[PDB]
Design a protein around this ligand. Structure first.
Ligand code: FAD
Ligand code: CL
Ligand code: CL
Ligand code: CL
Length: 474
């Protein structure tokens, strides 16, 4: 049998498979699609996702296949500028296609020793008090201690548990397409900016290889929710919302996505977990579905690997739902506000003009970017320092950065004075003694995902918060 079986070869399951392999966990990735989909969904990581890869040393391969972008207009298309005093060392946006993002995460999980069986489709599942039984379409049963559901928005695992999926349905659908056009490239650059003053969800971005990525609003709601949109439909929407069809060339692939904002009610149902789109779906327009799914698995990874090793605290796995469900609600809630600001009605247009006056303030622009990039996410840990909950930025230490010592996914203890020590938790927590100037506190205790659970200078105060997140001593 296996220790953990994840259901989904997407960027969420691959990120969870790598986090579990850092602790020697026999994992198994079940993916329905044999060949990975060539549909370029997302187009890059945000600041927090960039920091997540840096904590594992995966940032080099991402930066080799992409390029950094520091512009304005990521919040509801409000074309501004990038903030100045952004509390993060990776204050930029890496532009990598999701196909490359899934490719690097799959190669890293395979390099760490993860069974990725492509072509296996989960049909049914059931669980006892000792493990979970998985029934595949081919008829092969698989026993596992814990199973996590990363099988996308139409999650089969979620339906096999009764976990409700409440939220608002799809009301405003949009058309996306990677293509070229008979119109000049320089001519479209001057046309999009003029129409964007009213219809904000009309865009066009180049890919360098001669093709572009044009997103055009659609009319009505499609009843199939999976039917291939015709090319004549694409030009009819381009001529109605932009005044010119551009005469498109060869289209690589077309799609039509909705704006249904739904979120799972339970993230854990006793040995079965949900992550990524399996636990929350929201519109791609103002979306963090790739950033959220990565950070969801980045939160569950070290926690689930702590249970199979036997040192996890009592209700550690219960905190996955208690910490990643509110993050999905506020994200999903922000996506609705961003589409609302993109509405063409005279009401929402007046609110967008008010927001445009407020984003001129740097603190307002910084607050929105810190919330969108998810670098301001703060969990509930307890009472104490002002750092309790938030992650720790890449602090420049005396010898190298800070994220260069967290590759093994172990507990970190930044000790600037050296008088603090770990007694009995050496098997889970390291002891980095490096003086930093960006840190105004004597010592910080970091969870494997970077979030702070203790900050101070007392040894006895350290002895209080150590077993709360790392179990008892040896
Ligand atoms: C057009 C578009 C643009 C987007 N743009 C962005 C963006 O700019 N930024 C951003 O952050 N997010 C963006 N997103 C959202 C983000 O891409 C998704 O949320 C993300 O792909 C979901 O990650 P996941 O691995 O959890 O889901 P998936 O990638 O859907 O993973 C599910 C995988 O498991 C497989 N599977 C399904 N059911 C089963 C089963 N029963 N058994 C086995 N395997 C199964 C599926 O075939 C699939 O391969 C966009 C989404 C879309 C559609
Ligand atoms: Cl605007
Ligand atoms: Cl760097
Ligand atoms: Cl102003």
């Amino acid at each position: 049998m296996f220790d953990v079986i994840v259901v989904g070869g997407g960027p969420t399951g691959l990120m969870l498979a790598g986090e579990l392999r850092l602790h020697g966990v026999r994992v198994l990735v079940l993916e329905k699609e044999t060949e990975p989909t060539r549909q370029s969904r997302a187009q890059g990581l945000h600041v927090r996702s960039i920091e997540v890869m840096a904590q594992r040393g995966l940032l080099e391969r991402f930066l080799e296949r992409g390029h950094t972008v520091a512009v304005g207009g990521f919040f509801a298309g409000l074309a501004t500028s990038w903030p100045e005093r952004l509390d993060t060392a990776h204050s930029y946006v890496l532009a990598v296609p999701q196909v490359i993002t899934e490719q690097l995460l799959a190669e890293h999980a395979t390099a760490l020793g993860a069974e990725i069986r492509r072509g296996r489709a989960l049909v049914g599942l059931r669980q006892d008090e000792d493990g979970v039984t998985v029934d595949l379409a081919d008829g092969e049963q698989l026993r596992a201690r814990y199973v996590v559901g990363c099988d996308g928005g139409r999650s089969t695992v979620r339906k096999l548990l009764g976990v409700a999926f409440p939220g608002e349905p799809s009301r405003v659908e949009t058309l996306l397409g990677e293509m070229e056009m008979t119109a000049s490239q320089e001519e479209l650059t001057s046309v999009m900016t003029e129409v964007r003053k009213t219809q904000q969800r009309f865009g066009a971005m180049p890919l360098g290889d001669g093709v572009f990525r044009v997103v055009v609003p659609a009319e009505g709601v499609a009843e199939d929710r999976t039917a291939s949109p015709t090319l004549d439909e694409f030009k009819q929407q381009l001529r109605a919302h932009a005044g010119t069809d551009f005469g498109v060339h060869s289209p690589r692939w077309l799609s039509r996505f909705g704006d249904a904002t739904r979120q799972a009610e339970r993230y854990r149902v006793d040995r079965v977990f949900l992550a990524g789109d399996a636990a929350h779906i929201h519109p791609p327009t103002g979306g963090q579905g790739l950033n959220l799914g990565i950070q969801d698995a980045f939160n569950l990874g070290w926690k689930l690997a702590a249970e199979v090793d036997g040192w996890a605290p009592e209700g550690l796995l219960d905190t996955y739902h208690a910490e990643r469900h509110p993050v999905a609600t506020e994200v999903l809630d922000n996506t609705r506000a961003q589409i609302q600001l993109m509405s063409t009605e005279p009401g929402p247009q007046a609110v967008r003009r008010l927001m445009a006056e407020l984003v001129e303030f740097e603190n307002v622009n910084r607050y929105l970017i810190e919330k969108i990039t998810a670098i301001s996410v703060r969990y509930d840990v307890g009472e104490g320092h002002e750092l309790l909950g938030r992650r720790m930025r890449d602090l420049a230490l005396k010898h190298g950065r800070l994220y260069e010592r967290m590759h093994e996914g172990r507990g970190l203890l930044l000790d600037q004075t050296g008088r603090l020590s770990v007694a009995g938790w050496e098997d889970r927590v390291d002891h980095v003694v490096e003086v930093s100037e960006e840190l105004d506190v004597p010592a910080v205790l970091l969870r494997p995902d970077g979030h702070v659970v203790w900050a101070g200078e007392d040894q006895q105060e350290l002895l209080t918060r150590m077993p709360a997140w790392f179990g008892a001593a040896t």
